[PDB]
């Protein structure tokens, strides 16, 4: 495979041959799901415990002052990318003295992770962010990707076997743009509760969620605070 010395090369059909393989490298990562309402967007993540027991490698991250993220791929590379995103979001707090809008945020990181895809001997940022925030208009949510091609989506799921969570979540878009926080996050957890290997429970340990929107800071619900979100039997 002479296309192994390879973020400079092209496969002869159209393929760049490893920054879609970084998309494989975030298919391998842990599953998560974010979505948006008409008022406030939510993020929900299950956290893998590949150890004795842990904080299970805490996924959703505080970047911001209402522009929160959800990583899924490499963790050190994710932390590098959110120190970038974090630092220049605070730089837009410093200079312009307004909240940095979510679209320009995700676009300029979409131009920051695009440079090592271009040049030589530098791997792409193999992490699939699932960023979500509430700017002036409705609470946006952006999947971006290691191929530096973000998506202004609503209700996206990325991670391990997250396609089933999408196909639950695709056929339940009609009860979005309504459906307040108490009945919205239930509707996201029963979207997350399909990526699990078919044995019964979204426990309080592994599920960490985040809420952002109108008149509330991006708020992280850890091991304790996810316990008021409880329902569903399947």
């Amino acid at each position: 495979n002479q296309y192994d010395n390879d973020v400079t090369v092209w496969s002869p059909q159209g393929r760049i041959h490893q920054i879609e393989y970084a998309m494989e490298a975030v298919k391998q990562g842990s599953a998560t799901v974010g979505l948006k309402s008409k008022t406030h967007a939510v993020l929900v993540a299950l956290k893998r415990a590949q150890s004795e027991l842990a904080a299970h490698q805490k996924k959703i991250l505080h970047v911001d002052n209402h522009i929160g993220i959800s990583i899924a791929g490499l963790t050190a590379d994710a932390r590098l990318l959110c120190n970038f995103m974090r630092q220049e979001c605070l730089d837009s707090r410093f200079v312009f003295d307004r909240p940095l809008p979510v679209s320009r945020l995700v676009s300029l990181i979409g131009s920051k992770t695009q440079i090592p895809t271009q040049r030589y001997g530098r791997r792409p940022y193999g992490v699939g962010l699932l960023i979500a925030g509430y700017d002036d208009m409705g609470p946006h949510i952006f999947q971006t990707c290691p191929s530096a091609n973000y998506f202004d989506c609503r209700a996206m799921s990325i991670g391990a076997r997250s396609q089933s969570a999408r196909t639950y979540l695709e056929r339940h878009m009609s009860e979005f743009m309504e459906c307040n926080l108490d009945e919205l996050v239930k509707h996201g957890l029963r979207a997350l509760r399909e990526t699990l290997p078919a044995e019964q429970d979204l426990t309080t340990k592994n599920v960490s969620i985040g809420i952002v929107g109108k008149d509330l800071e991006f708020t992280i619900y850890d091991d304790d605070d996810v316990s008021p979100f409880l329902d569903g039997l399947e």
Partner: protein, 146 residues
């Protein structure tokens, strides 16, 4: 194909080919017998075997597209006892690099692990779990892919 050939070369396959393409488009009497060709590679071929007439329409076989693999997974799995709670569309849109031949398999060893469980009736995670078998190539110790 033909090349400037010093010490070793090859001329036997040259004569087989060059007598093939002249009872094909040599002299006139062609109008009885049609030809079908099938090659997994095209860049190996000189335009002698591509004279617009020797071999008419060079029809393209792509990868099976976003819908087609769901159709092929419905085709091959026609004889197996499939649950009504199945979804070929998420079996398609999850698994999109395959060239249609593997999708045939996906069905057949999906049924194989479906009887490795011992049930006489297959489910969706047989398919879903059957995929994580087409390639695999291991790679563990990933409690860190967050």
């Amino acid at each position: 194909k033909r090349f400037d050939s010093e010490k070793a070369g090859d001329r036997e396959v040259q004569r087989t080919m060059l007598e093939l393409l002249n009872q094909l488009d040599g002299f006139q009497p062609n109008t009885q017998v049609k030809v079908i060709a099938a090659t997994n590679r095209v860049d190996i071929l000189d335009p002698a075997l591509l004279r617009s007439g020797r071999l008419d329409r060079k029809i393209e076989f792509p990868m099976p597209n976003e819908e087609a693999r769901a159709r092929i997974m419905q085709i091959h799995s026609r004889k197996m006892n499939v649950s009504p709670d199945v979804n070929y569309e998420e079996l398609a849109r999850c698994t999109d690099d395959f060239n249609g031949a593997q999708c045939k398999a996906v069905c057949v060893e999906a049924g194989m692990i479906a009887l490795r469980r011992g049930a006489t009736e297959l489910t969706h995670e047989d398919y879903m779990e059957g995929i994580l078998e087409v390639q695999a190539k291991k790679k563990a110790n990933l409690q860190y892919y967050a």
